[PDB]
XYZ file of C-alpha atoms in Angstrom:
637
model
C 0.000 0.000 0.000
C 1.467 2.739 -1.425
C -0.969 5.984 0.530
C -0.086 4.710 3.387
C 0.736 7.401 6.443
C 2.422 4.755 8.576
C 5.609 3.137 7.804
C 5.932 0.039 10.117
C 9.809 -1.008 8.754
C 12.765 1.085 8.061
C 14.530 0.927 4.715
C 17.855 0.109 5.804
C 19.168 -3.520 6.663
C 20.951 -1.974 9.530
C 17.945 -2.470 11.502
C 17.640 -5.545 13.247
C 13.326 -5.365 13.851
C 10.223 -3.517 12.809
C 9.715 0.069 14.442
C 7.101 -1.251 16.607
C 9.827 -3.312 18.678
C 12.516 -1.270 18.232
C 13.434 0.454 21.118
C 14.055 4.231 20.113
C 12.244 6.970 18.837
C 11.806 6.516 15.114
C 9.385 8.377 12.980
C 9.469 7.436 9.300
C 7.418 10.468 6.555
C 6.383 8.467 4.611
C 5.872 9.357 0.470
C 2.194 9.693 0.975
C 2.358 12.486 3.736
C 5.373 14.305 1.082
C 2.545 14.602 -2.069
C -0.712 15.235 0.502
C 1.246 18.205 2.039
C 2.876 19.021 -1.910
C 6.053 19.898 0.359
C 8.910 21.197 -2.337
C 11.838 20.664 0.110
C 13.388 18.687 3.006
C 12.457 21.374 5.632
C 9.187 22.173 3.785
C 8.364 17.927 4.894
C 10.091 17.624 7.880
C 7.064 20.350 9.371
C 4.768 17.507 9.961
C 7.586 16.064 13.018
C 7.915 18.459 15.806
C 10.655 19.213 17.588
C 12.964 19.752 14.348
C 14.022 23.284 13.975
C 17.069 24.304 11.177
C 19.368 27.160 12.123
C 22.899 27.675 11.073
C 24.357 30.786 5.411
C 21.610 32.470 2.979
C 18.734 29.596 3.836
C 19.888 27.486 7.052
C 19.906 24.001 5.878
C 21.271 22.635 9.589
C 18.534 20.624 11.384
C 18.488 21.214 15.338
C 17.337 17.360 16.617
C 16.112 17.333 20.610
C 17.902 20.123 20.969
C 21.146 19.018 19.152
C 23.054 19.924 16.148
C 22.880 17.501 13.567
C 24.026 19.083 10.237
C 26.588 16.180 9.816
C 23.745 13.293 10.616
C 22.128 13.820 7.647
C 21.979 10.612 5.307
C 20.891 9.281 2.155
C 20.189 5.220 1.837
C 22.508 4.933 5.232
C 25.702 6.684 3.811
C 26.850 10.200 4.960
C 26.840 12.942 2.427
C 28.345 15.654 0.897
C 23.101 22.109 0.920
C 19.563 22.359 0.689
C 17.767 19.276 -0.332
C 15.067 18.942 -2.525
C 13.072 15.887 -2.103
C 11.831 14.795 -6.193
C 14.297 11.940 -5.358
C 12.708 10.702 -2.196
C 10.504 7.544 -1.230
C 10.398 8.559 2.402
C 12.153 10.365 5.410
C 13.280 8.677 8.513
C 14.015 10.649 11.991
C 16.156 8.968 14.598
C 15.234 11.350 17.646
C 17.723 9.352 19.973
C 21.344 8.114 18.597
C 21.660 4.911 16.883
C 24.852 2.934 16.306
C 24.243 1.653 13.107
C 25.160 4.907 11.936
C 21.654 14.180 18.992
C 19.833 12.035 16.541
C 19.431 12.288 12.783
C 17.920 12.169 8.990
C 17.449 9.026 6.862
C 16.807 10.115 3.238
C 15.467 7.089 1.634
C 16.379 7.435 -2.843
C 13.753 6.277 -5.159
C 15.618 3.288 -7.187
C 15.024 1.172 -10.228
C 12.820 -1.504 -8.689
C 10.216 -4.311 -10.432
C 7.223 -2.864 -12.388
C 6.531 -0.337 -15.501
C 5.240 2.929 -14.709
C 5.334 6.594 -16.087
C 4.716 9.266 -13.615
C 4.913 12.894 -13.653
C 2.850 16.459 -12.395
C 2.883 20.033 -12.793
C 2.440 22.301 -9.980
C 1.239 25.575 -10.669
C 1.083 28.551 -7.776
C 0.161 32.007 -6.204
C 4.131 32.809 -5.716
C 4.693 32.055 -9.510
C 5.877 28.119 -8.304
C 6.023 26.557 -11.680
C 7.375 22.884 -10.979
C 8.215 19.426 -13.405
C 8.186 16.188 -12.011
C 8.988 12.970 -14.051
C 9.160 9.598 -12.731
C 9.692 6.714 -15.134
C 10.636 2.856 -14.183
C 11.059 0.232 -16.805
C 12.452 -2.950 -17.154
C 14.386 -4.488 -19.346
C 17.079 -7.948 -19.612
C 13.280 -9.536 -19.934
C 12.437 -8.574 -16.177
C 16.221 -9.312 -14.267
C 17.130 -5.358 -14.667
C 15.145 -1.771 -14.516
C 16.180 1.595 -15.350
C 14.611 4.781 -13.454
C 15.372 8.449 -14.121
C 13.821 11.415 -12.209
C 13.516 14.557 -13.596
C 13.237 17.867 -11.927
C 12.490 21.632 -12.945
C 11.785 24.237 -10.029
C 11.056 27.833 -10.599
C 9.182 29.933 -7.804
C 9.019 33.662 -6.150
C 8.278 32.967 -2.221
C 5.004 34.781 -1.004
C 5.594 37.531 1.076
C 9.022 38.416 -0.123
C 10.241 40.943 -2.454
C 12.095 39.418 -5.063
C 13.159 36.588 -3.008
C 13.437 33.439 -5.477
C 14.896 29.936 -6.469
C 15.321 28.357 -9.341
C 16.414 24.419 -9.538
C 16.416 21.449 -11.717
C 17.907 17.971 -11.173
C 18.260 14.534 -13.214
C 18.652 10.934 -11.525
C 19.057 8.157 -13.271
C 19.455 4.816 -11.578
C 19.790 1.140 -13.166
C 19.522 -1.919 -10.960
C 20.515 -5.586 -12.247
C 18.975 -8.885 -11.057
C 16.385 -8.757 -10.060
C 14.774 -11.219 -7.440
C 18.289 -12.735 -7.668
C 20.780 -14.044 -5.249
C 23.194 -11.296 -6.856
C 22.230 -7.366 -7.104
C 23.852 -4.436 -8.480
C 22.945 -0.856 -8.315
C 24.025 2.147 -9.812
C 22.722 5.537 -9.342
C 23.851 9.252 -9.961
C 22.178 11.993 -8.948
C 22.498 15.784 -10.134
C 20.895 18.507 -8.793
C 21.921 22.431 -9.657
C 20.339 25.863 -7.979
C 20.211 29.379 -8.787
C 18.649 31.492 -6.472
C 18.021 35.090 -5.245
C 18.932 34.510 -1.476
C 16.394 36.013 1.038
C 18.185 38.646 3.762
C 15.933 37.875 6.331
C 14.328 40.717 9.082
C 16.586 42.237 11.442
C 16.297 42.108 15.329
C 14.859 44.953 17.387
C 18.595 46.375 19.263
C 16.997 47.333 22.225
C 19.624 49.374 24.805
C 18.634 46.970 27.800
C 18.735 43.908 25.988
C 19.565 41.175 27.643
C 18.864 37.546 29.080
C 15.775 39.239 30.618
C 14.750 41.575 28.182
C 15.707 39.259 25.252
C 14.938 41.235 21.503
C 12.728 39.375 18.459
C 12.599 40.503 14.724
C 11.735 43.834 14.135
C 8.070 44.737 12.800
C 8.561 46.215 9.008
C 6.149 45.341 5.668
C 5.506 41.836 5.265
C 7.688 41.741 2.242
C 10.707 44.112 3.228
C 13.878 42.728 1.297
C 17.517 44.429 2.269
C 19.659 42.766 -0.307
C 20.239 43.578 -3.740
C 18.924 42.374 -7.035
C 22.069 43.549 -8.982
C 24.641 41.744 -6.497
C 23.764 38.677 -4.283
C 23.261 35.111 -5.468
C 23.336 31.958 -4.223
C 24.447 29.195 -6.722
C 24.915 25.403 -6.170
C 26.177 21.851 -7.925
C 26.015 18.535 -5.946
C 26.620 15.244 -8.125
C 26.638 12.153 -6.630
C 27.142 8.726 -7.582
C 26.175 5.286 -5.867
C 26.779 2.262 -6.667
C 25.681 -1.024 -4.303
C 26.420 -4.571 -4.635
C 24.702 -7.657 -2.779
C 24.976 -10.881 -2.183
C 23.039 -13.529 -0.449
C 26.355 -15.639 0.716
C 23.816 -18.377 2.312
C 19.416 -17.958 3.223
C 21.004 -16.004 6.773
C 23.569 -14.115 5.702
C 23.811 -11.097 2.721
C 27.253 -9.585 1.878
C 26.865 -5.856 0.560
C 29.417 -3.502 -0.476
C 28.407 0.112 -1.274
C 30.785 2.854 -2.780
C 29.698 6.473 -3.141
C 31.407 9.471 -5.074
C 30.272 13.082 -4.134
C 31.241 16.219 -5.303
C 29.508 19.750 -4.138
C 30.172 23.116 -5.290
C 28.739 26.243 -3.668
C 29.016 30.165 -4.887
C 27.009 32.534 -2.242
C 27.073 36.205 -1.398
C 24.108 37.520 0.509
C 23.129 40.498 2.712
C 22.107 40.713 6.707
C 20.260 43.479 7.769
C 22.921 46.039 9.790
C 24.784 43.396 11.588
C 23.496 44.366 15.308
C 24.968 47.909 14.687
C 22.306 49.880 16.037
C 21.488 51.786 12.670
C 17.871 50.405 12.975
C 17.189 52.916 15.866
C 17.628 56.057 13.456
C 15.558 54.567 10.509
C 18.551 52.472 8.823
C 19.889 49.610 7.599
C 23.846 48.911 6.498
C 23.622 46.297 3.341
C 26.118 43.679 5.089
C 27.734 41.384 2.937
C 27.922 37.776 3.824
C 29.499 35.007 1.372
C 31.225 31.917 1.034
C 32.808 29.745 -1.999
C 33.290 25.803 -0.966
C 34.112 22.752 -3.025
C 33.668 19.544 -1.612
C 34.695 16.106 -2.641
C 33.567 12.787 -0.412
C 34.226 9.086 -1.331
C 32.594 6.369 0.755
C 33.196 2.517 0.765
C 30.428 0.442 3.169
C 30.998 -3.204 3.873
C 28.370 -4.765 5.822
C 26.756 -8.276 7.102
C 23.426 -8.773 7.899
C 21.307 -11.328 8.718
C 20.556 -14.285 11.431
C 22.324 -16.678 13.682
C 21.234 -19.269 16.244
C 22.600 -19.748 20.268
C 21.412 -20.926 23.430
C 17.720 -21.150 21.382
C 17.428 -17.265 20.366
C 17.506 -15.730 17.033
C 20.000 -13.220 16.689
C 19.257 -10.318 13.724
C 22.475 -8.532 13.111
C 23.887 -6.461 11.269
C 28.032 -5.417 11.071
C 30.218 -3.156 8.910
C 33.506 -1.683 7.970
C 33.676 1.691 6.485
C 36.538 4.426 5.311
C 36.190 7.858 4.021
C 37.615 10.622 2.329
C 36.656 14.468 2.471
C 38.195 16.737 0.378
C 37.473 20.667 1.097
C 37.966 23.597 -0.020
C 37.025 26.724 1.383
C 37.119 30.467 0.292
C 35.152 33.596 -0.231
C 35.429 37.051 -1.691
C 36.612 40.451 -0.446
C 33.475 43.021 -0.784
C 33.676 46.819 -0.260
C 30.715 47.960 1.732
C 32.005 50.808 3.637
C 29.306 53.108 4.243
C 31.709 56.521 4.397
C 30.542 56.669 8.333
C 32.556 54.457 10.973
C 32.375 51.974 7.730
C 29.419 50.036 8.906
C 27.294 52.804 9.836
C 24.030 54.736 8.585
C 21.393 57.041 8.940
C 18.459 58.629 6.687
C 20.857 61.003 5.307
C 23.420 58.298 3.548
C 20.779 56.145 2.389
C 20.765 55.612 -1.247
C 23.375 57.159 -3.497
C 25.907 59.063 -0.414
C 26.741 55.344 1.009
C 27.189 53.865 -2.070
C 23.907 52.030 -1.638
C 25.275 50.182 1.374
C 22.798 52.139 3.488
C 18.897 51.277 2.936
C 15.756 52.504 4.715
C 14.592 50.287 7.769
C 10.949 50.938 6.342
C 11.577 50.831 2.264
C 14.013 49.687 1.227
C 15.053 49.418 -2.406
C 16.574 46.104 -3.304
C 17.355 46.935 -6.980
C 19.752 50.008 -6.054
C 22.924 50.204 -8.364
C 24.796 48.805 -5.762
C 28.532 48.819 -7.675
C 32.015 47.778 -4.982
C 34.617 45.657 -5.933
C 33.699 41.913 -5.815
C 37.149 40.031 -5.685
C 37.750 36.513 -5.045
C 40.306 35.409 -2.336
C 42.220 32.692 -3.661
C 43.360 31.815 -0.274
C 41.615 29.039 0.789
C 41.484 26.779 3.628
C 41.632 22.995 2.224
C 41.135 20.255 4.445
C 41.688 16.433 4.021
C 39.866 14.259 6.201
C 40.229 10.213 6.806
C 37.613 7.854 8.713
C 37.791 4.305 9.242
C 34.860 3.061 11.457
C 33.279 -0.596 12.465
C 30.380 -1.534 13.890
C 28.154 -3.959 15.340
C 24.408 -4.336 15.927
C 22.425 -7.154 17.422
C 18.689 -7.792 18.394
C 17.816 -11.307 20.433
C 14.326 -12.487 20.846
C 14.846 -14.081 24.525
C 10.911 -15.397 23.642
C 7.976 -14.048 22.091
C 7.228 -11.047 25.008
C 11.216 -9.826 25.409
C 14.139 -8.863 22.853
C 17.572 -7.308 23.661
C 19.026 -4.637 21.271
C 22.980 -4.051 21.609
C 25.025 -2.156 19.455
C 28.373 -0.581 19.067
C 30.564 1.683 17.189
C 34.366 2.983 17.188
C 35.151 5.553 14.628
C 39.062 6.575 13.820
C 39.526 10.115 12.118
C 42.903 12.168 10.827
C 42.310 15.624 8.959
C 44.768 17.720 7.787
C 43.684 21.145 7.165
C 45.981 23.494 4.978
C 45.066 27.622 5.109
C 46.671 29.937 2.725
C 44.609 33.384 4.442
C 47.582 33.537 6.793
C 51.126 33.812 6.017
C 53.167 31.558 6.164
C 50.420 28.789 5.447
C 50.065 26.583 8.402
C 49.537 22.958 8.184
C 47.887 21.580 11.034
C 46.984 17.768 11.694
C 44.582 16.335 14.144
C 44.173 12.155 14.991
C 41.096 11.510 16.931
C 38.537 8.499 17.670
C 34.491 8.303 18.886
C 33.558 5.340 20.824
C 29.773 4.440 21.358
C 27.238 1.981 22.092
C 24.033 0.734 23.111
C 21.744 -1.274 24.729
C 17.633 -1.239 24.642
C 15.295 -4.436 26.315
C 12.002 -4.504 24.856
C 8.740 -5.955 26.803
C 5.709 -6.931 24.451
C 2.902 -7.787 26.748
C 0.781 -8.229 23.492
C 2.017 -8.778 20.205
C 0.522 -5.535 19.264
C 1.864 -3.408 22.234
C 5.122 -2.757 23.190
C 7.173 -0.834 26.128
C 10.669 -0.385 26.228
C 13.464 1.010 28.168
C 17.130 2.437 26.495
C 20.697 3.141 27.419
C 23.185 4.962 24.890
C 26.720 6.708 26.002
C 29.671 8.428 23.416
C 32.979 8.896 24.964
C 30.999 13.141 25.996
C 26.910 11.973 25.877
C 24.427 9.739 27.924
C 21.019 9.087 26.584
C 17.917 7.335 28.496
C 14.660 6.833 27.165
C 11.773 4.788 28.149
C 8.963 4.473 25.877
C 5.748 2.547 24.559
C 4.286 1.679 21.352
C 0.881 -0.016 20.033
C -0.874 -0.952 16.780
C -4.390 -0.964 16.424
C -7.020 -1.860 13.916
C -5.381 -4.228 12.446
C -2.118 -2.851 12.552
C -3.234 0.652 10.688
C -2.649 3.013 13.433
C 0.702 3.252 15.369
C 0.615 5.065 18.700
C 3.629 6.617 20.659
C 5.054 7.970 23.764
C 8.413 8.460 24.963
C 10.683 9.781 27.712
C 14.279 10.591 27.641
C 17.051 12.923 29.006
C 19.933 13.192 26.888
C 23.379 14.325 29.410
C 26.276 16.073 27.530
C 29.728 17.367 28.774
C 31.751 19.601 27.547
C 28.550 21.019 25.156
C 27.576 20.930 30.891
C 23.881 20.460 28.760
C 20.612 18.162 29.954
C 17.564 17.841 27.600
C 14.722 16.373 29.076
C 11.561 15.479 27.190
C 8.435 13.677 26.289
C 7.573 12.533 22.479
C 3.912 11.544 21.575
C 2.886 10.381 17.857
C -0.160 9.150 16.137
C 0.103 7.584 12.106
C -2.069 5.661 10.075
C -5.867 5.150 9.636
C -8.263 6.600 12.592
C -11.257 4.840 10.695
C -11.331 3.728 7.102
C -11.942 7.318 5.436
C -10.225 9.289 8.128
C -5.930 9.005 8.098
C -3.626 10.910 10.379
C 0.352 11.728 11.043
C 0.733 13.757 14.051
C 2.935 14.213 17.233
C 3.751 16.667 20.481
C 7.354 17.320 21.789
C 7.780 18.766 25.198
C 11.718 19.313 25.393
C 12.815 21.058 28.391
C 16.653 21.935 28.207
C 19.266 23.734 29.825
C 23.002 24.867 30.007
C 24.499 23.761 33.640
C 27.490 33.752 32.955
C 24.662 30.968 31.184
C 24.312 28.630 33.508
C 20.706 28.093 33.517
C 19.878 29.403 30.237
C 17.689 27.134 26.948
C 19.583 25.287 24.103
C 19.000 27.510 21.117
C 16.969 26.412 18.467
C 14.974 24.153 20.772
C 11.530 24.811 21.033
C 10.112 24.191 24.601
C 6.827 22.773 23.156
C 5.369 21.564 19.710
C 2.591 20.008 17.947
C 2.384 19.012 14.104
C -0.961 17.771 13.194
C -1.959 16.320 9.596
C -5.188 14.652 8.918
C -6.952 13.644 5.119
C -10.898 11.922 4.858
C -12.221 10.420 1.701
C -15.364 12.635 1.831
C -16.618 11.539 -1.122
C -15.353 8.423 -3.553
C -12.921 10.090 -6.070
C -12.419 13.187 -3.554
C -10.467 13.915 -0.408
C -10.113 16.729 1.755
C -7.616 17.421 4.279
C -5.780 20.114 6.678
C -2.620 20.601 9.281
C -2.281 22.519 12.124
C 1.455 23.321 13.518
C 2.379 24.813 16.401
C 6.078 26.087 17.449
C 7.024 27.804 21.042
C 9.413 30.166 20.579
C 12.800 29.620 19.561
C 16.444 31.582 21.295
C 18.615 32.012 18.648
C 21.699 32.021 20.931
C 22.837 30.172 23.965
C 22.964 33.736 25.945
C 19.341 34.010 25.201
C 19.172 37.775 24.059
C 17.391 37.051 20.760
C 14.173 34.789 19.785
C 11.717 34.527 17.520
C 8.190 33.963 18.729
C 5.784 31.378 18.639
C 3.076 30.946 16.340
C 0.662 28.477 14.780
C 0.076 27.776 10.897
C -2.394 26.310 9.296
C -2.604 24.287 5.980
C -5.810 22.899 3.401
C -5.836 20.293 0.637
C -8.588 18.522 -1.454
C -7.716 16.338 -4.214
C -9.901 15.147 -6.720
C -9.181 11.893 -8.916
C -10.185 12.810 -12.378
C -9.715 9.386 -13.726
C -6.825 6.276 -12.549
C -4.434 8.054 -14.742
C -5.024 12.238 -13.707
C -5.388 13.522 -10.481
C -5.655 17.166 -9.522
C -4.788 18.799 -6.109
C -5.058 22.198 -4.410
C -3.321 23.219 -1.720
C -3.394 26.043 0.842
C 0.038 26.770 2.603
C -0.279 29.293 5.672
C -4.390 29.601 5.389
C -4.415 32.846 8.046
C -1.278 34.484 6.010
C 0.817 34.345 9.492
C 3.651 36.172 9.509
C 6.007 34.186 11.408
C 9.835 33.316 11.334
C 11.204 29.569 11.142
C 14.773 30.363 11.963
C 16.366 32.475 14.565
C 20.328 33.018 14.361
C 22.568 33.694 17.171
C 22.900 37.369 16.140
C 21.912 40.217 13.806
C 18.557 38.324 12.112
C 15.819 35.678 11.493
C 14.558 34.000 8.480
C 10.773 34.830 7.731
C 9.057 32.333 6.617
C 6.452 32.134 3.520
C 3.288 33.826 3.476
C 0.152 32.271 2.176
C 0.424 29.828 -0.858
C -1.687 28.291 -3.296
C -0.574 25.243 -5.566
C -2.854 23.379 -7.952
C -1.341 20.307 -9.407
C -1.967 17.989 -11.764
C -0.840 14.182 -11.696
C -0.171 11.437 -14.165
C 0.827 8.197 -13.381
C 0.281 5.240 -15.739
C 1.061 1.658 -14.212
C-alpha cells in the first residue's frame, strides 16, 4: 500500500526489527504524507515532526534534533553525504530522535531506485508565488524482467510569497539502473544531479533594544511583510552537488547477505548575501547597512560500506544482526570574496541622510528599502583558501535477540578513527595543522511486548561526551493501521555541561477507514548547567504538528494541518528569539480518472507572519506567506 501514512519497517538492513519493537524513537514520513502536504523541500516535509528546527548561510539548511546539532547526521540510503535538499528523489524520510549505532539524533533520506514494475509518472504544480514545478518519474524494465532503469527529472522555478524578489530556481536529473532482479546477486548504480540558482532572502533584522539582555531578550523587528535588504544587482546563491552510488549484494547463504556500497560526491557552492545592519544599532535612526555575507566551498567525499546482515542461532534465540567496515575521504575547499561595503561613516554605519546614493547604496531605509539600487564595490575573489583532508575508518556492530515471544535485547556498538589535515593559505606563512582523533559508542535497549501488538521499552546509549535514556511505549491498532507513541528521555552532555529532558507523543495511520492521520507533540525542556541556567537555542520548549486527510466523497479527499512552534532563542545567551506561532494548511484532491489527479493546496491559510529560523545574532529568516498550488498528476502503471 502505497498511501499509506504509517511506515511500520525502516529501509535500511541496519535495523535488526520492525519500528514497533525497536526500542528508540523513530518516525518514518512516509511518500504519501510528502505529495498530501505538496512539500517542495526537506524542511518544507520535515514540518509535519515536531521538535525539528534548522538554524545555522543564505537559507539554514542545519537541522536542530532534541535540541542538538545535527548538520553532519544527515543521510541518504545509510551513507553520509556531501546544501539544501530537494526531495523529487525521495521515497520517504526517517528521523532517529535518539542516537543509533548503526550509523543528537538524525535524517534518513530514503532514494527512489530502479525496482520491479513499468510505470510513467509525472505532475505540474502551478502557484500564487509564480511556483512553476516538473516532475517525471519513469521505471522500466528491461534484460526480460532481471534489470530496470529509473530516471527522475526535476524543474523548479518559484518567487516565495511575502518576499520581495526573493526566489529559487532548480532542476535535477537521476538516473538509476539496478541488475537482477529477485536474484541471489544485485547491483545498483545511481547518480544523482541537482543544480540551484537562487536570489537569497536577507531575512528581518532584530529589534537592538539598549537593555537587551537575558531578561529583556529582543525578536525581529516589525517592518512590511515583504521588506527585502539585499540587492537584485549583487547577491546570489548558486549550487552543484553530483553524486554517484553504486551497491552490490549478495546472499552468501538464506542467513547471511554480503553488501558492499561505494559512493562518489562532489559539491560546489558560490554565495554572497546580505544581513540586515549586523546588530549595529542603525535600525534605531531609521537604517539599515547592506552587510555582505558570502562563502565559496568545493567539496569532494568518497565512501566505501561493507556490511553483514542477517541471522544466527545460540542458546535457542535468534539473533538479527547487522556489522560493517567503512573508510572515508573528504576533500574541502574553502574560500570567499573580499566586498567593499564601507558606508563613508565608521564603515558600517548609517542614517536617513546616507541612504541611497551618499553610502554607495550600502545604506537602505529600515521601512523601504530598495533592493534593486545600483549597488557597484569591488567583488574580488580570495584565492586563499582553507583545504582540508579528512580520513575515517569506522566498524560496527548491531544485534537484536528475541529471549521469547514477550522480550528482545538490542545491543550495538561503534568505534570511529579520524585524521584531517587542514591546509590555510589566508595567513602567512600557510600553516599545516593535523589532528588524529577516535568516537567510541554503544548501546543497549530491552524490549517488553505484553501483546504482540503493544510494546514498552526502556534504552541506554553513552559516546565517549553523551548519555542518553529513554523509556517508551508503542501499540498498533485496527489491524495494525494506526501506530501510537510515547516516549521519555534525558539526553546528558559534557563539555557542550547540557541536559535535555523530554516527552515525544505520535499518532500515524488510519483513525477509521476514510479518516488518516500523522501527528505528534514534543515537550523538550533543556538547559546549560554567565549561562548557567539558560535554553539550548533552536529548541523549542513545546510543539505540535498535526496532519489529517478523509475520503469525503469516492474520487475526492479533503484534508488540513495545524502546527504549532514555542518560541525559539537564537543564541545560547538568550538575548534574541523569535516567537511562537501556529500555521495552518488545506488540501482537497480530486481523482479525475486512474491516470489524472488534480490537487489544491493552501500553505499558511491565516497568512501568518512568522519566522522559522532564529540566528545567534543580527537576524531571522521569515518564513512564507500564504500559498496556493494546484497540481496535476499522471501516473500510468
Amino acid at each position: 500500500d502505497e498511501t499509506t501514512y504509517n511506515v511500520d519497517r525502516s529501509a535500511s538492513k541496519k535495523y535488526t526489527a520492525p519500528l514497533l519493537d525497536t526500542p528508540r524513537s523513530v518516525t518514518v514520513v512516509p511518500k504519501q504524507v510528502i505529495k498530501d502536504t505538496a512539500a517542495v523541500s526537506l524542511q518544507d516535509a520535515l514540518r509535519t515532526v515536531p521538535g525539528i528546527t534548522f538554524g545555522a548561510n543564505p537559507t539554514g539548511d542545519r537541522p536542530f534534533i532534541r535540541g542538538f546539532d545535527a548538520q553532519s547526521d544527515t543521510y541518504v540510503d545509510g551513507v553520509r553525504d556531501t546544501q539544501t535538499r530537494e526531495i523529487f528523489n525521495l521515497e520517504q524520510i526517517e528521523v532517529s530522535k535518539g542516537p543509533n549505532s548503526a550509523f543528537g539524533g538524525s535524517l534518513n533520506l530514503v532514494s527512489k531506485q530502479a525496482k520491479a514494475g513499468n510505470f510513467i509518472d509525472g505532475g505540474f504544480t502551478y502557484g500564487s508565488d509564480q511556483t512553476r514545478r516538473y516532475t517525471l518519474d519513469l521505471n522500466q524494465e528491461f534484460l526480460d524482467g532481471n534489470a530496470a532503469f529509473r530516471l527522475n527529472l526535476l524543474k523548479h522555478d518559484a518567487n516565495v510569497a511575502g518576499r520581495d524578489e526573493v526566489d529559487v530556481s532548480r532542476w535535477g536529473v537521476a538516473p538509476s539502473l539496478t541488475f537482477g532482479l529477485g536474484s541471489p546477486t544485485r547491483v545498483t548504480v545511481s547518480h544523482y544531479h541537482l543544480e540551484s540558482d537562487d536570489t537569497p532572502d536577507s531575512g528581518i533584522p532584530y529589534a537592538k533594544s539598549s537593555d537587551r539582555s537575558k531578561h529583556n531578550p529582543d525578536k525581529p523587528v516589525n517592518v512590511d511583510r515583504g521588506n527585502f535588504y539585499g540587492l537584485t544587482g549583487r547577491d546570489f546563491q548558486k549550487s552543484r552537488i553530483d553524486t554517484s552510488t553504486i551497491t552490490v549484494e549478495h546472499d552468501l547463504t538464506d542467513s547471511l547477505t554480503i553488501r558492499n556500497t561505494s559512493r562518489y560526491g562532489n559539491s560546489h557552492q558560490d554565495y554572497l548575501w546580505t544581513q540586515p545592519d549586523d546588530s549595529q544599532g542603525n535600525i534605531n535612526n531609521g537604517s539599515v547597512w547592506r552587510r555582505q555575507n558570502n562563502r565559496v566551498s568545493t567539496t569532494t567525499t568518497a565512501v566505501n560500506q561493507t556490511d553483514l546482515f542477517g541471522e544466527f542461532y545460540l542458546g535457542g534465540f535468534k539473533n538479527s544482526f547487522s556489522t560493517g567496515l567503512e573508510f572515508s575521504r573528504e576533500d574541502s575547499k574553502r574560500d570567499g570574496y573580499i566586498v567593499d561595503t564601507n558606508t563613508g561613516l565608521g564603515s558600517n554605519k548609517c542614517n536617513p541622510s546616507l541612504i541611497g546614493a551618499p553610502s554607495g547604496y550600502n545604506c537602505t531605509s529600515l521601512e523601504n528599502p530598495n533592493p534593486h539600487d545600483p549597488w557597484n564595490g569591488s567583488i574580488t575573489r580570495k584565492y586563499a583558501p582553507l583545504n582540508t583532508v579528512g580520513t575515517t575508518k569506522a566498524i560496527y556492530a548491531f544485534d537484536t535477540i528475541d529471549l521469547n515471544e514477550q522480550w528482545q535485547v538490542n545491543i550495538g556498538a561503534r568505534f570511529d578513527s579520524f585524521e584531517t589535515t587542514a591546509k590555510n593559505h589566508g595567513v602567512r606563512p600557510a600553516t599545516k595543522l593535523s589532528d588524529k582523533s577516535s568516537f567510541w559508542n554503544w548501546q543497549a535497549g530491552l524490549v517488553w511486548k505484553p501483546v504482540p501488538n503493544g510494546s514498552i521499552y526502556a534504552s541506554y546509549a553513552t559516546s565517549a561526551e553523551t548519555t542518553n535514556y529513554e523509556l517508551g511505549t508503542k501499540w498498533a491498532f485496527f489491524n495494525e493501521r494506526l501506530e501510537l507513541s510515547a516516549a521519555i528521555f534525558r539526553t546528558d552532555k559534557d563539555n557542550t555541561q547540557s541536559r535535555v529532558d523530554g516527552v515525544e507523543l505520535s499518532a500515524s495511520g488510519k483513525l477509521t477507514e476514510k479518516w488518516k492521520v500523522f501527528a505528534g507533540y514534543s515537550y523538550l525542556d533543556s538547559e546549560l548547567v554567565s549561562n548557567n541556567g539558560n535554553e539550548m537555542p533552536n529548541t523549542p520548549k513545546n510543539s505540535f504538528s498535526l496532519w489529517t486527510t478523509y475520503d469525503i466523497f469516492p474520487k475526492t479527499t479533503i484534508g488540513g494541518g495545524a502546527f504549532y512552534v514555542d518560541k525559539v532563542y537564537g543564541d545560547v545567551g538568550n538575548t534574541v528569539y523569535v516567537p511562537d506561532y501556529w500555521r495552518y494548511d488545506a488540501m482537497a484532491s480530486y481523482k479525475l480518472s486512474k491516470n489524472v489527479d488534480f490537487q489544491l493546496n493552501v500553505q499558511n491559510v491565516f497568512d501568518k507572519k512568522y519566522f522559522d529560523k532564529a540566528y545567534a545574532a543580527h537576524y531571522a529568516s521569515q518564513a512564507a506567506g500564504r500559498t496556493i498550488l494546484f497540481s496535476t498528476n499522471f501516473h500510468f502503471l
